[PDB]
Amino acid sequence: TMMSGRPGRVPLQFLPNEARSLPPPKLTDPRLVYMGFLGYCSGLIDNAIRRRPVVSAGLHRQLLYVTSFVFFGYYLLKRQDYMYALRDHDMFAYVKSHPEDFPEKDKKTYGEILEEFHPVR
Amino acid sequence: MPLVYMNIIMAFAIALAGLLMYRSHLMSSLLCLEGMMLSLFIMSTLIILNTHFTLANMMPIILLVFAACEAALGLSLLVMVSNTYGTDYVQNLNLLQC
Amino acid sequence: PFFDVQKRLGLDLDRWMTIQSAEQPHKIPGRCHAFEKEWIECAHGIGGIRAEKECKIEFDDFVECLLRQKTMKRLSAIKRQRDKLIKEGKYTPPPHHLGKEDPRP
Amino acid sequence: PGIVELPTLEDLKVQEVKVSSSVLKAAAHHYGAQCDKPNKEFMLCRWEEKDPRRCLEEGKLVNQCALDFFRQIKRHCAEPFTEYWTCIDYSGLQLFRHCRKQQAKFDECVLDKLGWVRPDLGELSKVTKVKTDRPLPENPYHSRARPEPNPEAEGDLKPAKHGSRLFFWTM
Amino acid sequence: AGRIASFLKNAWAKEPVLVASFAIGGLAIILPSLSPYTNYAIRINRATPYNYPVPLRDDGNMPDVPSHPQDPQGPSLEWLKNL
Amino acid sequence: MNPIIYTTLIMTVMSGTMLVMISSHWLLIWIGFEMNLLAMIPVLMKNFNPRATEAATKYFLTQATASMMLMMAIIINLLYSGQWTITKMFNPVAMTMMTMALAMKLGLSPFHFWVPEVTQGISLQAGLLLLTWQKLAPLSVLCQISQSINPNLMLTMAMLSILIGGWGGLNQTQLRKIMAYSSIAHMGWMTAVLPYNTTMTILNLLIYITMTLAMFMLLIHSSATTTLSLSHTWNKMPVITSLMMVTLLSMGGLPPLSGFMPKWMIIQEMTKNESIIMPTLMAMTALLNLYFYMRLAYSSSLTMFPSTNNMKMKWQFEHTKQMKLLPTMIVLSTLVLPMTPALSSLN
Amino acid sequence: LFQAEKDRRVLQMLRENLEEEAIIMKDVPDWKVGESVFHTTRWVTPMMGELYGLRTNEEILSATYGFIWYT
Amino acid sequence: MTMYIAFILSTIFVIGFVGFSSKPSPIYGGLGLIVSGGVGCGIVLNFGGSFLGLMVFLIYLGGMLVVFGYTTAMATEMYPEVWVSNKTVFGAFVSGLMMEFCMVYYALKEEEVEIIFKFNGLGDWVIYDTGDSGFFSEEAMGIAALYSYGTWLVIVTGWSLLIGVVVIMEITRGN
Amino acid sequence: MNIMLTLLTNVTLASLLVLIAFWLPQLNAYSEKTSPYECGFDPMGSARLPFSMKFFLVAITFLLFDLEIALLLPLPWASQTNNLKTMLTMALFLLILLAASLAYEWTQKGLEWAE
Ligand SMILES: CCCCCCCCCCCCCCCCCC(=O)OC[C@H](COP(=O)([O-])OCC(O)COP(=O)([O-])OC[C@@H](COC(=O)CCCCCCCCCCCCCCCCC)OC(=O)CCCCCCCCCCCCCCCCC)OC(=O)CCCCCCCCCCCCCCCCC
Ligand SMILES: CCCCCCCCCCCCCCCCC[C@@H](O)O[C@H](CO[C@H](O)CCCCCCCCCCCCCCC)COP(=O)(O)OCC[N+](C)(C)C
Ligand SMILES: CCCCCCCCCCCCCCCCC[C@@H](O)O[C@H](CO[C@H](O)CCCCCCCCCCCCCCC)COP(=O)(O)OCC[N+](C)(C)C
Ligand SMILES: CCCCCCCCCCCCCCCCC[C@@H](O)O[C@H](CO[C@H](O)CCCCCCCCCCCCCCC)COP(=O)(O)OCC[N+](C)(C)C
Ligand SMILES: CCCCCCCC/C=C\CCCCCCCC(=O)O[C@H](COC(=O)CCCCCCC/C=C/CCCCCCCC)COP(=O)(O)OCCN
């Protein structure tokens, strides 16, 4: 709908070249840590379903789970940030290019505005 | 719009209603489906012939091909239903009621 | 939903057949080729929402070429008035409208 | 919306080339060899204007040149040409193949009397240049002014203020 | 390469129709790529004038476009007359 | 069935869906639908019995009628505008025909009748395929033409689907019919937000597919097709039943589970418009789905039903073939709500 | 030559139709004689209903099904 | 209004559709659909689509032969029904006939909208093209372009046909 | 026009032949003469009872093979295209798949009648 068609957009890129001008998410980002937690939970559920010692059965496969989730999460976060940056860029440009639709109103002080008073009793 | 277009569209609507209404034999419903293909083919051909679009002259051929695919599918299903029950009556297809 | 693999790869799997103004064999033109190209050009690059209101004239001409409702109504009106006037009997069409003309090559 | 302007009947009057299709097919090769310039001017007008009303004089020139060509044929030898187009007229497909002798006689006459050489295979189908003083039409499609496009996406990308801004999230 | 001979012997003894069909189909598949006459067929198809050749406007910078059909410029079909 | 033929048929189904998704031509989308149906019919009949034949026949008849209507809508659109490209759908009558055709392909009410019968009549693998993969193509086409979609008709069908799924699910003891009715209700939730934001439609689609894959894979792990056969699972696989109960809660839509996120986003998107009454009715109706999910959870995990003596022999044997991604689907189906803002990578 | 002759013949038939409908429809109060149904002012190929509309049914059938029925 | 041939053919088309739409036995439904296929072939002949009309006639003739075989094998009864042997079949037949006549009358008499938008009639000859061009036929060139332009269509169609053969094998396997 | 006249003439001639055949001779029909023909005796069942079809699988394949004819009949015109190499590749592809479908049904005993 709203973002589906935009000028100069490569169809299946998933990460345009203009996204590299944004700060990458830190490796200690809390969302990445949550993705790693999801990987750990997947590994534990894998151990429990297959009737293996849940905490200690397979360490290599649990590590693979955690790193796979973190790896996908990093690029997911990059794309998320890029799309939000595009949204803000477009909104600001549209506000700037249409001044008559977003006019700066007169600043009034609370000493001048008359608000009706509703007593509590 | 011409009047032949009315006639073709009425033919399509009649075939659709005939398919929707079920009497007994499954075969008659497949006949209605094939009639709907026939009407769609005629309508497409007339529109394609009237405005000289040259490259769409092939799409009625593809339409007939996939019509035949539907017809074969329906015939295979009718064979299996008749083998199960001995008749192609839609009244027998009620096991999934419960 | 729509994965534009063709646009990514530059493939042209089915775009050759979408419009009447696109490279027919032996350069055979559509009946409404000029109207369609005018509508597409005017329509191009402005987006769907803008296009309906802005290019409405070109699309209206294209639809008139495709279905010919207005021309048929005008011809029917002229024919009906002519029939009424000949029933009244004050028109007497010329010989060249009764097959009594002099044809030309 | 608007009035269609049509030529008057006196503007559509010319001397007609009233020979049948067999006569025309018998003459066709030499006619294309000789009458090429007016025909090419007319056809350039035709595909450049896209309007029959803007190329009437060129068509009248086509008729005039064809009439002079047939007048020359009638003046110098009409008997071999009559035999040739009688052949062509007999067959239902008007095949050239069915008498090459009468065509040979016609070619010999037009070569040793008028100095005409029959075009070879692949010559009448060539795309040729034609030199005309007629100005190139500025806008034959009568197009309007195209609407102005959406301006552009200009500027450098900066991170979203306060991130996503969805409910309670801080990034 | 030794057992395939016996396989073909058995096929020719029992299913000559299938052997003929496969040989003919394989020849039809492979021969057109090894023929020098398919290019001639393409060029014959390309030289058939179905449509009217619309003339070009003379701008003075076309040394290879004929001004008349009998001019030496343009494509030649002498290869076709001798073919 | 031969494994090679089965793989070929599954890839033909998937290729038909992909052809529907990657095509800009109406005829090619129709061909994709037809190829999908042609390869899909035998898969429902992989295990042969009269019920599978019935399900295949009913599915074939419904999808063939839908294909009829879709081709007729395409032809009418061509007649009123010589366009073959999937776009705004210049004619409204053709648009109504197309909307009903795609809704009947999806199973939206009042065309919902075929879904419970077909799901019950086939195996759990074919049911998984039918209720997950077969929804992508019609929803993709609906997304592509949502600008010209009529709000009155689409929203009516969506509300009808939610109501009917909730009501029909209450009466069901078989698990496949419960899954079919929940599928109908989720379809209604997906198509309600379609005229407003297709990103929310895609998000609900992905969440529903994850939950449905988890639930079918759990029902295949514990070979249960009825309520009482699933009541036995706690005596052999307690962990499976606990995971199933958490997945059911997620399906119900209670926070902080993954299932809550799609409805939460759809309600927000609808209230960005005026649209206040309809989301309220949608939530109050999804309460019914939560109710019969809780009935299943009571029968399967929160109470212990009587068992049989022969279960002692099953106690000695392991599950032979383990389906991959079951652990991943469970985790994504429960613990993903904190990652909600990542939906911005969907538009 | 055939192109030139066809252009002249079509234009003459259109002019005859123009004069005839100018005579016929002049009684109608608000009828614009010769009005086009298109917004554009470029030439539009006729429809055979605009050429043979006022002529006899024999000519109409010879123009419509003449080549199709000639076998 | 010139010999009404296209009108008559389209009316017979609708009549045949009503005939087989009634479901008054497969043998007679096949006859009705055969008649409809023939008259539709004629309808598209009258517009210049000779190849398409002939080919659809041929295809439907083959299909109806297969359907006749299948009707004698698996869709038959002691007393097959004809259009006058049953009240429901006759009622549907006459209802379809009167509906067709009613829409024809309300279309020829008045230009009033039925479903999509009101039409004109005036004879379908009016909307022709005056097209004077070509030593070939447009339809045949368009159909022949299936091999030069329509590579993708050929690929998908051939795959569908091979898959359909496999599918009928698997469905009728049995067991 | 002429094909319509030809069809009308042929149908009318056949109909007049039937009319002559039915109204010229002396008819004497009684219940025994018009009874169904078995060789000497009365039939046990009806001719409207189901008649089993042992080649039902070949009949369905005939529908799919018949539509492969609609795809190949425009081949005489397709040979006149400029780019013959892509046409010949597509025409041979359309026949190899037709040959492979025939081979598949043959090897899986699809061409054998039900016993
Ligand atoms: C918000 C904050 C965080 C919260 C997040 C959410 C919760 C946490 C994540 C959840 C997923 C993680 C684990 C899932 C798989 C585990 C399955 C399991 O059974 O576990 C058995 C396993 C014990 O089994 P075992 O030792 O192999 O041998 C005994 C047999 O296996 C015994 O086998 P058995 O066959 O006898 O078991 C039978 C039993 C088995 O049934 C179960 O165990 C239930 C399985 C849990 C379902 C999980 C579904 C997905 C998660 C969704 C959570 C929802 C949260 C939202 C709130 C709603 C609550 C539902 O079933 C029953 O008896 C029927 C009871 C019916 C009760 C119904 C309620 C069940 C659902 C409740 C789920 C709530 C969350 C539970 C989390 C922990 C549960 C283990 O438990 C564990 O040992 C794992 C616990 C966690 C390990 C972490 C330790 C790491 C190191 C510690 C140090 C930390 C950092 C150090 C650094 C510091 C520096 C010094
Ligand atoms: C429970 C969550 C379910 C998640 C479902 C599976 C999770 C893994 C997804 C698999 C990742 C690979 C998919 C694509 C990677 C490369 C292909 C690339 O080209 O995709 C592009 C972009 O990638 C995908 O479009 C986005 C995939 C991102 C999926 C994750 C979002 C999940 C929703 C929020 C829930 C939080 C999940 C947290 C992680 C578990 C397509 O761009 P575009 O051609 O223009 O889109 C056309 C269709 N549109 C415009 C209508 C959208
Ligand atoms: C092959 C293609 C070209 C053919 C060209 C010639 C066409 C020939 C016409 C076809 C009929 C020829 C049949 C030869 C004998 C005629 C049989 C029948 O038509 O005549 C009588 C039909 O008449 C009625 O039965 C009774 C007559 C009462 C009705 C009056 C006739 C209607 C017209 C009104 C009166 C005008 C009389 C003629 C003056 C103009 C007999 O009827 P019926 O007895 O059952 O059957 C017995 C026939 N037998 C005796 C020969 C065995
Ligand atoms: C990139 C990754 C693909 C992975 C997916 C594979 C699945 C699909 C199979 C292969 C993709 C098919 C793409 C072909 C699209 C056709 C268009 C393109 O290829 O050009 C054509 C090239 O023609 C070639 O013949 C392409 C076909 C060759 C492949 C043979 C078919 C085998 C495909 C495998 C699937 C078929 C199922 C059965 C297996 C045998 C035509 O070129 P040309 O004629 O210059 O231009 C025509 C336009 N004109 C008129 C202006 C001149
Ligand atoms: C590369 C070319 C591809 C296109 C060309 C082919 C076009 C048409 C040919 C294929 C059509 C379908 C093929 C049918 C396959 C039949 C398989 C089969 O099962 O047949 C066997 C019979 O045949 C066999 O035994 C298997 C294959 C036998 C030979 C088939 C061809 C082998 C290769 C021959 C040529 C090799 C390459 C060319 C070199 C030729 C040497 C000069 C079974 O016989 P039944 O009739 O069922 O038994 C009833 C009697 N009791």
From Swiss-Prot, chain B:
Record keywords: Electron transport, Membrane, Mitochondrion, Mitochondrion inner membrane, NAD, Respiratory chain, Translocase, Transmembrane, Transmembrane helix, Transport, Ubiquinone
BP terms from Gene Ontology: ATP synthesis coupled electron transport
Keyword rRNA-binding: no
GO CC aspect terms: mitochondrial inner membrane; respiratory chain complex I
UniProt keyword Transmembrane helix, yes or no: yes
Database matches in InterPro entries: NADH_UbQ_OxRdtase_chain4L/K, NUOK/Mnh_C1-like
Pfam family, one: Oxidored_q2
Ranges that cross the membrane: 1-21, 29-49, 61-81
Enzyme nomenclature, EC number: 7.1.1.2
Catalytic activity: a ubiquinone + NADH + 5 H(+)(in) = a ubiquinol + NAD(+) + 4 H(+)(out)
Subcellular location per the Swiss-Prot or TrEMBL entry: Mitochondrion inner membrane
Covalent S-S links between cysteines: none
GO function term, MF aspect, one: NADH dehydrogenase (ubiquinone) activity
Membrane topology type: Multi-pass membrane protein
Subunit structure: Core subunit of respiratory chain NADH dehydrogenase (Complex I) which is composed of 45 different subunits.
Family affiliation: Belongs to the complex I subunit 4L family.
PANTHER family from the UniProt entry: NADH-UBIQUINONE OXIDOREDUCTASE CHAIN 4L, NADH-UBIQUINONE OXIDOREDUCTASE SUBUNIT ND4L
Function noted in UniProt: Core subunit of the mitochondrial membrane respiratory chain NADH dehydrogenase (Complex I) which catalyzes electron transfer from NADH through the respiratory chain, using ubiquinone as an electron acceptor. Part of the enzyme membrane arm which is embedded in the lipid bilayer and involved in proton translocation.
Name assigned to this protein: NADH-ubiquinone oxidoreductase chain 4L
Organism: Sus scrofa (Pig)
Gene name of the encoded protein: MT-ND4L
Swiss-Prot record, chain F:
Molecular function in Gene Ontology: NADH dehydrogenase (ubiquinone) activity
Topology of the protein relative to the lipid bilayer: Multi-pass membrane protein
Keywords: Electron transport, Membrane, Mitochondrion, Mitochondrion inner membrane, NAD, Respiratory chain, Translocase, Transmembrane, Transmembrane helix, Transport, Ubiquinone
Localization annotation: Mitochondrion inner membrane
Translocase in keyword set: yes
Broad class of the protein's primary localization: mitochondrion
Pfam families assigned: NADH_dehy_S2_C (PF06444), Proton_antipo_M (PF00361)
GO CC terms: mitochondrial inner membrane; respiratory chain complex I
UniProt entry tagged with the keyword Cytoplasm: no
Reactions it catalyzes: a ubiquinone + NADH + 5 H(+)(in) = a ubiquinol + NAD(+) + 4 H(+)(out)
Transmembrane region(s): 3-23, 25-45, 59-79, 89-109, 149-169, 178-198, 200-220, 237-257, 274-294, 325-345
Subunit details: Core subunit of respiratory chain NADH dehydrogenase (Complex I) which is composed of 45 different subunits. Interacts with TMEM242.
PANTHER family on file: NADH-UBIQUINONE OXIDOREDUCTASE CHAIN 2
Name used for this protein in its record: NADH-ubiquinone oxidoreductase chain 2
From Swiss-Prot, chain H:
Membrane-spanning segments: 1-21, 25-45, 47-67, 88-108, 149-169
Signal peptide: none
Enzyme Commission number(s) of this protein: 7.1.1.2
Molecular function via GO: NADH dehydrogenase (ubiquinone) activity
Enzyme class: translocase
Keywords: Electron transport, Membrane, Mitochondrion, Mitochondrion inner membrane, NAD, Respiratory chain, Translocase, Transmembrane, Transmembrane helix, Transport, Ubiquinone
GO CC annotations, alphabetized: mitochondrial inner membrane; mitochondrion; respiratory chain complex I
GO biological process terms, semicolon-separated: mitochondrial electron transport, NADH to ubiquinone; mitochondrial respiratory chain complex I assembly
Membrane topology summary: Multi-pass membrane protein
The keyword Transmembrane helix is annotated on this UniProt entry: yes
Catalytic function, reaction form: a ubiquinone + NADH + 5 H(+)(in) = a ubiquinol + NAD(+) + 4 H(+)(out)
The UniProt record lists the keyword Glycosyltransferase: no
Location of the protein in the cell: Mitochondrion inner membrane
Pfam families: Oxidored_q3
Main localization of the protein described in the UniProt heading: mitochondrion
PANTHER family xref list: NADH UBIQUINONE OXIDOREDUCTASE SUBUNIT ND6, NADH-UBIQUINONE OXIDOREDUCTASE CHAIN 6
Biological function: Core subunit of the mitochondrial membrane respiratory chain NADH dehydrogenase (Complex I) which catalyzes electron transfer from NADH through the respiratory chain, using ubiquinone as an electron acceptor. Essential for the catalytic activity and assembly of complex I.
The family this protein is said to belong to: Belongs to the complex I subunit 6 family.
Subunit structure: Core subunit of respiratory chain NADH dehydrogenase (Complex I) which is composed of 45 different subunits.
Protein known as: NADH-ubiquinone oxidoreductase chain 6
Organism: Sus scrofa
From Swiss-Prot, chain I:
Keyword NAD applies: yes
EC number, UniProt record: 7.1.1.2
Gene Ontology molecular function: NADH dehydrogenase (ubiquinone) activity
Domain of life according to the entry: Eukaryota
GO BP field: mitochondrial electron transport, NADH to ubiquinone
Keywords linked to the UniProt accession: Electron transport, Membrane, Mitochondrion, Mitochondrion inner membrane, NAD, Respiratory chain, Translocase, Transmembrane, Transmembrane helix, Transport, Ubiquinone
Transmembrane segments: 3-23, 55-75, 86-106
Membrane topology: Multi-pass membrane protein
CC per GO annotation: mitochondrial inner membrane; respiratory chain complex I
Reaction it catalyzes: a ubiquinone + NADH + 5 H(+)(in) = a ubiquinol + NAD(+) + 4 H(+)(out)
Protein's cellular compartments: Mitochondrion inner membrane
Biological function: Core subunit of the mitochondrial membrane respiratory chain NADH dehydrogenase (Complex I) which catalyzes electron transfer from NADH through the respiratory chain, using ubiquinone as an electron acceptor. Essential for the catalytic activity of complex I.
Family per record: Belongs to the complex I subunit 3 family.
Assembly information from the UniProt record: Core subunit of respiratory chain NADH dehydrogenase (Complex I) which is composed of 45 different subunits. Interacts with TMEM186. Interacts with TMEM242.
UniProt protein name: NADH-ubiquinone oxidoreductase chain 3
Origin species: Sus scrofa (Pig)
Originating gene: MT-ND3
